[PDB]
Design a protein around this ligand. Structure first.
Ligand SMILES: O=C(O)[C@@H](O)[C@H](O)[C@H](O)COP(=O)(O)O
Ligand SMILES: O=C(O)[C@@H](O)[C@H](O)[C@H](O)COP(=O)(O)O
Ligand SMILES: Cn1ncc(Br)c1N
Ligand SMILES: Cn1ncc(Br)c1N
Lengths: 550, 550
């Protein structure tokens, strides 16, 4: 049970409202730097990873100073962020509405600390699944695991949706530099038959391995897609005895895995306390281990574990994911910015914003607190993003000159995996990272536009307000370990936000309802008779579809 | 000049504020359907394309009724939407800040109507470039255009960024069903060297054609990328005279094309009055014509032309793109919703939201009106989206149960290009389309949550408010002509928004700024000497990068 009902009940909340009115609303980052020559030192933090590599988190272009951050930290204290965090790490059932522990942190427990759920250590059970993933992925990669005609596997197809899809997609893309030629990964997720048809169109059943990724192993899209893949496989292989060399499952539900026809030896398990949007660290990440090797996947886990330890052991005022969470609350609830922008200056990370979009919005898009009362304040923001430099040529127009405050995270690796032309492209990429955040902060006033040649009515169109905030995250290199730490950072930033808003960041009753909505209409689409069982729009859409379908 | 200064100066603006307070804020869509037995008929419109195919635009689940819509139409008349539109179609220089015509509508003038810029018809000049595009794309597809060793082309790589990239990407993905095996398209855009390295990895210089796509032919990323591709080509081909069989240009700047070493005969031209984010209809679309054939590209243009004629000739109250734009203004400026969601129930259109994100935000992310004064109201919204059904398992949680109003457009084709398993996947896909908009409207109240078995504090967590608005767009099938009409619909929706806000939807001074920002820091990255020429954050980021760079 909760220690308070609403975030607006916390005494520091109304003090932050007063601080917003007096100094927040018209905050000048320019004046902040002029006042405080040590500003960069004071509002940037270096994170040291377990492998001694480093990530610089620079928050100093944000609309924040010592007064504001001190108040936000007091708010996090009043909200019991530390109490809820420690309960999470203790394995307590802090997912109250499903009565579950929340224990993705136990998935990356490579140190084998005691991490118990229901009083029983999980360390060895998690480690045993990882040992199975290492053995299997090693045998795929070295060719000893052969298909039903005795050939080595060349293509691995993950079939799953949502939390069982986007992690694998984003991480295999982000770590693609660590893959091997001739071993490729693919992803079927959408129920839209296009996804099945286009993915399988040029694959060979004799050299294709399927991972059916599903926590429940009952999701309509996934089971239907898995059935279509099994039918495609059997069209060439004929005998169901051969499925055991070509189909594995990533799941919590062994009974449904076996009933679908997958051997239990080919099941890689996890537990109910792994949320789908927190699941890439589990058996769900098997496609990652196959694509880049288990050791790289293990280094990915160890990066998350090192960020977990930072989150667990650091006083709030120097706790990097807490600081990031506090700034989001500041913008969302006091400035009323509804969105947050994430821009990787990194092409490999092109699906990173989409992954954070699920993690953030599915966690914190809630309207009821842990006191089981409705909120009267904003919760989760809308997250969006695309890679730079592309984004600089498109919606950055609105980030620079529109009428909406859009807090933004920019991410750059100091070193490229592809340093072509003696780093000519990389230096250009980095120069854009620095110059864009600079320009959003400094802007361009009326006098400078005039000095640059504009006259008359053109002048205001070319002005830039400045004081548009960014966080810059500079890594040395986007290694597996660095990516692990970066995702965990955003996991714990999300945790911090949710704790302040007093919501359950770990259920998803809107996604759960969606999984049961479509069946009734699906039955109505089986016969061609007109329908009048819904509202007039739903009827009209269905009936127009029936007239236009095949 | 402008006929008014600010949108808040239009008399209907204050009336819409009164209507928002009295009818809008607490609008019940459930009540609306109960009150109006003809609501679906009254708030849905069937668009008929030039080829007699049809698209149903169903707005009836929006927070709108006859009174509200009639006031929005009156606002559109006061704003002179029609006068600005007619000026656009007449070739007038309505891009005031750059003193340019805005004539993407002339690109798809396949009827060869008289469409003059500066008093001179553009019809034959546009048609001549399309004739060149047909000739060249025909020769690529039939194998008669051969590489420098006499082989037919198997791979086409577009090199460009922003408006010279995203349309070609999105449309080739969207119309992929119309491609043929053995002729593939690829896209280099990011300056990040990863994009060059990974795209050229498996390609053969002997059979690869490059299209250098740049309106100006001076953009730093694109010319740098184009130089790298030329270096890659020449590392195998050795002789620069081979460039003429492997490099073409899509540009307005012939002198810079020729200076780069591309034969003028290999240039596909267009004019200054084609904005990048409106350019896929021009020579910029050459990759589309190559990938799917010129006649399909031409049908795509003809679908846009038909939607143009709808927009041009239809009174406002039945004008489909106008209605879409008026609703956006209603949500943005009276409900205060900062975002707009676009969800294609269609895997081929997975890049459609990203394309609209550029179209929308780069057009309408502006703070100054055509009277050259700053706005005192919100302008362009933040657009985002992913295809369904994937979106239903992730950020739809927030759409259903968060604290933010998120107006949403759902798009579905009644017929799939891949109707596998006797349309089993397609019927499931369709059922989710109907069920999701239905659930967002009807919700689930406390009594039903209790009837479904929840008790005590769990109940509020499983409630859904309903009255969350959607627009449903149902096409017969996403053909080239359908996609052409769909993009043009959103172009003219964006038009209508910007005309009411009285902004210039067709310049982009923040994008123009971005392309001149990085050079100063780029020259400082030629050294590893520490820099102190900027603010302390920019200095600190640059100096930390120098310490960590390779
Ligand atoms: O976030 C979620 O809970 C969803 O996206 C699930 O991951 C998705 O519905 C698939 O569920 P499952 O893994 O049980 O097949
Ligand atoms: O919308 C825009 O204007 C930009 O995205 C441009 O398309 C981009 O900067 C590329 O410019 P160009 O076509 O001149 O190379
Ligand atoms: C506010 N925010 N930004 C990134 C992420 Br993940 C969240 N929750
Ligand atoms: C508001 N809106 N929705 C889609 C697009 Br393109 C715009 N401008």
């Amino acid at each position: 049970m909760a220690s308070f009902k609403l975030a607006t009940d916390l005494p520091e909340w109304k003090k932050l409202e007063e601080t917003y009115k007096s100094v927040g609303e018209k905050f000048s980052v320019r004046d902040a730097f002029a006042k405080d020559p040590k500003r960069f030192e004071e509002f940037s933090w270096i994170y040291k990873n377990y492998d001694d590599s480093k990530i610089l988190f620079d928050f100093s272009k944000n609309l924040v100073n010592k007064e504001i951050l001190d108040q936000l930290v007091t708010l996090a204290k009043e909200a019991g962020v530390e109490k809820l965090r420690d309960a999470m790490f203790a394995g307590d059932h802090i997912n109250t509405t499903e009565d579950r522990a929340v224990y993705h942190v136990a998935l990356r427990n490579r140190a084998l600390r005691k991490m118990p759920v229901d009083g029983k250590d999980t360390a060895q059970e998690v480690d045993d699944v990882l040992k199975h993933m290492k053995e299997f992925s090693d045998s795929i990669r070295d060719g000893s695991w052969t298909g039903y005609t005795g050939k080595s596997i060349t293509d691995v197809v993950n079939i799953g949706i949502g939390g069982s899809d986007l992690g694998p997609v984003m991480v295999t893309e982000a770590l693609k530099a660590y893959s091997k030629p001739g071993l490729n990964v693919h992803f079927i997720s959408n129920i839209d038959g296009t996804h099945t048809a286009e993915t399988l169109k040029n694959l060979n059943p004799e050299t294709t391995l399927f991972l059916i990724a599903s926590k429940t192993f009952t999701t309509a899209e996934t089971i239907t897609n898995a059935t279509s893949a099994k039918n495609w496989f059997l069209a060439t292989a004929k005998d169901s005895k051969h499925i055991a060399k070509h189909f594995a499952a990533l799941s919590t539900n062994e009974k449904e895995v076996v009933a679908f026809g997958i051997d239990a030896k080919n099941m890689f398990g996890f537990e109910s306390w792994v949320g789908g949007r927190y699941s890439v660290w589990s058996a769900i990440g098997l496609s990652v281990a196959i694509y880049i090797g288990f050791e790289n996947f293990n280094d990915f886990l160890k990066g998350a574990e090192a960020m977990d330890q930072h989150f667990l052991t650091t006083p709030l005022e120097n706790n990097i994911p807490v600081i990031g969470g506090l700034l989001s609350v500041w913008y969302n609830n006091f400035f009323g910015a509804q969105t947050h922008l994430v821009v990787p200056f990194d092409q490999y990370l092109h699906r990173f914003p989409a992954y954070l979009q699920q993690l953030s919005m599915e966690s914190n898009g809630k309207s009821v607190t842990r006191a089981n009362v409705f909120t009267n304040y904003q919760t989760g923001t809308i997250l969006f993003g695309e890679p730079a430099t592309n984004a600089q040529h498109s919606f950055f127009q609105l980030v620079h000159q529109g009428t909406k405050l859009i807090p933004a995270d920019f991410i750059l690796a100091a070193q490229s995996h592809n340093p072509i032309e003696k780093n000519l492209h990389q230096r250009m990429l980095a120069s854009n990272f620095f110059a864009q955040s600079e320009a959003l902060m400094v802007g361009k006033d009326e006098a400078k536009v005039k000095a640059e040649g504009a006259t008359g009515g053109l002048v205001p169109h070319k002005e830039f307000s400045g004081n548009r905030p960014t966080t810059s995250i500079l890594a040395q290199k986007i290694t597996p370990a660095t990516l692990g730490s970066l995702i965990a950072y955003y996991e714990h930033l999300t945790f911090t936000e949710g704790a302040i808003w007093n919501i359950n960041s770990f259920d998803q009753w809107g996604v759960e309802l969606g999984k049961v909505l479509a069946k009734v209409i699906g039955k109505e689409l089986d016969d061609k008779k007109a329908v009048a069982t819904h509202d007039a729009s739903t009827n009209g859409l269905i009936n127009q579809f029936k007239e236009w379908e095949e």
